[PDB]
Amino acid sequence: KYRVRKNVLHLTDTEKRDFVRTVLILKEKGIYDRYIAWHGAAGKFHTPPGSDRNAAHMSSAFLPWHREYLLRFERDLQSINPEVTLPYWEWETDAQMQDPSQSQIWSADFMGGNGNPIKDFIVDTGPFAAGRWTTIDEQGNPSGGLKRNFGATKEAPTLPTRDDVLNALKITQYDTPPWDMTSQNSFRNQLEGFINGPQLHNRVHRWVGGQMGVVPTAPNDPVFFLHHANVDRIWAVWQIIHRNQNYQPMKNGPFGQNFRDPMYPWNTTPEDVMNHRKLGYVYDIELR
C-alpha cells in the first residue's frame, strides 16, 4: 500500500513530466527493450505447443502475467526515480467523449497524439514521436518509429465503455475450462476481450492501432503500460468484490497456466502476484 498508482487525468504536470522523463531513460539505458522482447517471447510460447494459448495471452495466465510484467517495470522506474509510479489510462471514461482522441493523455507533454496520415500514421507529436523514440519490429530489429491510428478499424471503432467494464466485474468465475479464448462466463476471458471480441482489453489495442494493434510490437508504445495498468486495476477491483473467488485453474490446466506454475519467461507464478497489495502498490480509487 506504499506505491500509489494514479489515474492519468489526476496526474500533475510535474508527475507527467517525471513519468515521461523516467521512461526515455529506461529506453536510453536499454532496459525498456527488455520488456518489448519479454512480451513478444511469451506471445510465441504456447501452452502446450500447437495450441493457441500462450504464456501471456488467450489463457488464464493473461492477468497475472501482465501484473508481474507491470510489477517489474515500475521497480525499474523507481530505480531511476522513487517518486514515480505507473499511472493508468481509464479508457472507459474516455469512451464517454464524442471524440476520445481529444483526451488529455494524448497531449504533447505526455503520450503524444494520433498518427500522421501523410506519414503512414507515424506519430510526430509528443515525447515518443519519430526521431525521439526508436522502435523495434516483431523480429527484434529497428523499425523506424511509433505509429497510431485511433478507431480506424470496423471491429473496434470505439473504446470499451464503463458499462462494458461493469458487466465484466459481475462475472463470478475467474476463468473456466478449456482455459482459452473460448471460455464462457469467464472474467479473465471477458476482460481479455474474446467474448464477442474484440472487447475491453483487446478492443483497446485494436482501437489505438499502430504497434499497439499487434501482439509482438505493442509495448513499443509507452501507453501499453498505462493501458494494462488500467486492466490490472479492473482485475484488482474484481478481486476485492469477489473475495472468496480464486485463480483458476488450480491444477490440471496446461503447464504454465496453473496457480503454482512458473509464468514463462520467468519463474514467477500466478500465486506470487494474486494480491496486488503484497507487491507494494495500490490504486488511488482504493483510497477514495
Ligand X SMILES: Cc1ccccc1C(=O)N1CCN(Cc2ccc(F)cc2)CC1
Residue with smaller CB distance to ligand X, 151 or 197: 197
Task: Please pick, from the candidates 147, 206, 233, 276, the single residue that binds ligand X as defined by CB under 6 A.
Answer: 206
What single-letter amino acid sits at 276? H
112 neighbors 78 (Cβ within 8 angstroms)? no
Among 218, 193, 198, 117, smallest CA distance to 157 is for 198
User: What residues form the annotated binding site?
Assistant: 10, 13, 39, 46, 52, 57, 66, 68, 92, 109, 120, 163, 201, 205, 228, 242, 276-277, 284
Respond yes or no on whether the N-terminal peptide bond of residue 48 is cis (omega within 30° of 0).
Answer: yes
Task: Please pick, from the candidates 113, 198, 222, 249, the single residue that binds ligand X as defined by CB under 6 A.
Answer: 198
CB of 94 to ligand X, least distance (A): 17
198 φ, ψ to 5°?
Answer: -85, 135
- Residue 146 as a binder of ligand X (CB under 6 A): the answer is no
CB of 36 to ligand X, least distance (A): 11
Report helix, strand or coil for 163: helix
Report helix, strand or coil for 148: coil
Number of residues that bind Cu ion (CB under 5 A): 1
- Residue 197 as a binder of ligand X (CB under 6 A): the answer is yes
How many Å apart are CA 92 and CA 162, to the nearest integer? Answer: 5
Q: Of 2-41, which residues contact ligand X (CB under 6 A)?
A: none
User: What residues form the annotated binding site for Cu(2+)?
Assistant: 39, 57, 66, 201, 205, 228
209 neighbors 123 (Cβ within 8 angstroms)? no
How many Å apart are CA 61 and CA 95, to the nearest integer? Answer: 27
How many Å apart are CA 213 and CA 206, to the nearest integer? Answer: 5
User: What residues form the annotated binding site for Zn(2+)?
Assistant: 10, 13, 39, 46, 52, 57, 66, 68, 92, 109, 120, 163, 201, 205, 228, 242, 276-277, 284
Residue with smaller CB distance to ligand X, 87 or 198: 198
Q: Of 49-68, which residues contact Cu ion (CB under 5 A)?
A: 56
141 φ, ψ to 5°?
Answer: -110, 150
Task: Please pick, from the candidates 64, 112, 126, 193, the single residue that binds ligand X as defined by CB under 6 A.
Answer: 193
How many Å apart are CA 279 and CA 71, to the nearest integer? Answer: 8
CB of 124 to ligand X, least distance (A): 23
Task: Please pick, from the candidates 194, 235, 238, 281, the single residue that binds ligand X as defined by CB under 6 A.
Answer: 194
Residue with smaller CB distance to Cu ion, 76 or 232: 232
Q: Indicate the residue whose CB is closest to Cu ion.
A: 56
How many Å apart are CA 176 and CA 248, to the nearest integer? Answer: 7
Number of residues that bind ligand X (CB under 6 A): 12
How many Å apart are CA 113 and CA 136, to the nearest integer? Answer: 20
Positions in the binding site for Cu ion (CB under 5 A): 56
Positions in the binding site for ligand X (CB under 6 A): 57, 193-194, 197-198, 202, 205-206, 213-215, 218
